[PDB]
Swiss-Prot record, chain A:
Species: Homo sapiens (Human)
Function recorded in the entry: Its interaction with CUL3 suggests that it may act as a substrate adapter in some E3 ligase complex. Does not affect the function of Kv channel Kv2.1/KCNB1, Kv1.2/KCNA2, Kv4.2/KCND2 and Kv3.4/KCNC4.
Originating gene: KCTD5
Subcellular location(s) of the protein: Cytoplasm, Cytosol; Cytoplasm; Nucleus
Induction per the UniProt record: Up-regulated in peripheral blood lymphocytes stimulated through the T-cell receptor.
Domain notes from UniProt: The BTB (POZ) domain is atypical and mediates the formation of a homopentamer instead of a homotetramer.
Protein name, as recorded: BTB/POZ domain-containing protein KCTD5
Quaternary assembly: Homopentamer. Interacts (via C-terminus) with GRASP55/GORASP2. Interacts with CUL3 and with ubiquitinated proteins. Interacts with CRY1.
From Swiss-Prot, chain D:
From-to range in the entire protein, with total length: 97 to 191 of 768
Protein's name in the database: Cullin-3
UniProt disease link: Pseudohypoaldosteronism 2E: An autosomal dominant disorder characterized by severe hypertension, hyperkalemia, hyperchloremia, hyperchloremic metabolic acidosis, and correction of physiologic abnormalities by thiazide diuretics. Neurodevelopmental disorder with or without autism or seizures: An autosomal dominant disorder manifesting in infancy and characterized by global developmental delay, variably impaired intellectual development, and speech delay. Some patients have seizures, others have autistic features or behavioral abnormalities. Additional variable features include cardiac defects, failure to thrive, or brain imaging anomalies.
Miscellaneous comment text of the record: High-glucose conditions in renal tubular epithelial cells lead to up-regulation of CUL3 expression, significant increase in CUL3-mediated ubiquitination of MRPL12 and dysregulation of mitochondrial biosynthesis.
Family: Belongs to the cullin family.
Compartments it resides in: Nucleus; Golgi apparatus; Cell projection, Cilium, Flagellum; Cytoplasm, Cytoskeleton, Spindle
Organism of origin: Homo sapiens (Human)
Its job: Core component of multiple cullin-RING-based BCR (BTB-CUL3-RBX1) E3 ubiquitin-protein ligase complexes which mediate the ubiquitination and subsequent proteasomal degradation of target proteins. BCR complexes and ARIH1 collaborate in tandem to mediate ubiquitination of target proteins. As a scaffold protein may contribute to catalysis through positioning of the substrate and the ubiquitin-conjugating enzyme.
Tissue-wise expression: Brain, spermatozoa, and testis (at protein level). Widely expressed.
Top-level taxon: Eukaryota
Modifications made to the protein after synthesis: Neddylated. Attachment of NEDD8 is required for the E3 ubiquitin-protein ligase activity of the BCR complex. Deneddylated via its interaction with the COP9 signalosome (CSN) complex.
Amino acid sequence: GSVSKWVRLNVGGTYFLTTRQTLCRDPKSFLYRLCQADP
Amino acid sequence: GSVSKWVRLNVGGTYFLTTRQTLCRDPKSFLYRLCQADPDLDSDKDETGAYLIDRDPTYFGPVLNYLRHGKLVINKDLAEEGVLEEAEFYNITSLIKLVKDKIRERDSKTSQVPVKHVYRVLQCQEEELTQMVSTMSDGWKFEQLVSIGSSYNYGNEDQAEFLCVVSKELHNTPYGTASEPSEKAKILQERGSR
Amino acid sequence: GSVSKWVRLNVGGTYFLTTRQTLCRDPKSFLYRLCQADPDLDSDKDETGAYLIDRDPTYFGPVLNYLRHGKLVINKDLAEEGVLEEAEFYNITSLIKLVKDKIRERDSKTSQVPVKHVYRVLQCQEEELTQMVSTMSDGWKFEQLVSIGSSYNYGNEDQAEFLCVVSKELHNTPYGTASEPSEKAKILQERGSR
Amino acid sequence: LNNNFLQTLNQAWNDHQTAMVMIRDILMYMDRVYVQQNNVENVYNLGLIIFRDQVVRYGCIRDHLRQTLLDMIARERKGEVVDRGAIRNACQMLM
């Protein structure tokens, strides 16, 4: 779990600590599903 | 890191953390067996619990990209031959054929008989000459302008007084040729040929 | 480690996690004496047991590919001169020879005459001109068009009106000239000369 | 059917929708390229139409729902305290 405001995503094991809002900038994307907390 | 449903593989000394099915995409591969349980294996890093697999990560990159999404990728700093031999070691015959075709395209575009270049002969007289010369389309390169000898309408004027041969290089290899079966096209070509 | 099935080398501060046999591929290599545990060794990472070698990770890569899969493949961003330097430093005589051969072919191409252009003189009357220029064969480049004065009809309206010099490059210099002997071909050439 | 049939239909539909949002999330691409290039339906309206033709357009459910809703709205017209939220749920379903 990394999503409260900001995501510390592991893209291929590479750390990307980015903003969920600019992630949601695109209307809908595969990352966009990862923006919201889901099981 | 741990080796689990997500597997941590040490190619060249660098760790790639990938998904089990991504490597399990196709049996024809070195990594198929590695995905399976193996008591046959002895050269694995017990210091971090990861498989130390021999092969450079750079040429392993495009192989992993293919094995994720079924297509190769060639960087402008990465050797096509290098990813070719990476395919050779890891034994993905479809990927071997695809990278061989990529090398074929690279060589053919640079071969003794190139695929590029295409030539046209516009015709204009002096009055309209500078017009179509200046307005001449982008990407096309002017090649030669010739006048024509004339025994009709002496002086600088004729209805074919100048022929402007122009040309442009082509990028036919990615787009592909327009040669494909179509019988009506063949009929039209024959009719226009004679 | 000091002694292990797998070796953790340190080229320019970058760890290469490879196998003993890759280094033990040939015994005329600098890396073979590097691999052995014998006197006159004080340059190693004494915190993990990694052999810290003062060599570039750039040109070590293509060389390591030679001992990993029998062939050296240079990167598009690494000079074959650099890999020749590295092979000579590691005294891999076969590799030195192969890289020298590759450099010889490359320099024969680059220094002068990379290709040997062939030239042809099509003869076209004005009417068909554009089409046979448009349908001019793939891999050939237009080079020149010249009219010819004639007493049949000066300038326009001639069936030998235009002489079109076209050409194409040929990769025979970097690969070497090819020829085979045959007496019948020679006597036929003599017939053709007269 | 006797025990708050409308609420059971509500729960079954809610399960349909919660699963169906996810199902669309998985098959985004088939919605994107295959549906567009083939001029067919997407996943979501497909699931809604199938819910229509396999639950709503089925005799017993259809007529029981219709009669229950008519009786409930008549009773609410008379001023009797009945679950208005149930009526709202059914009306949006049928919408």
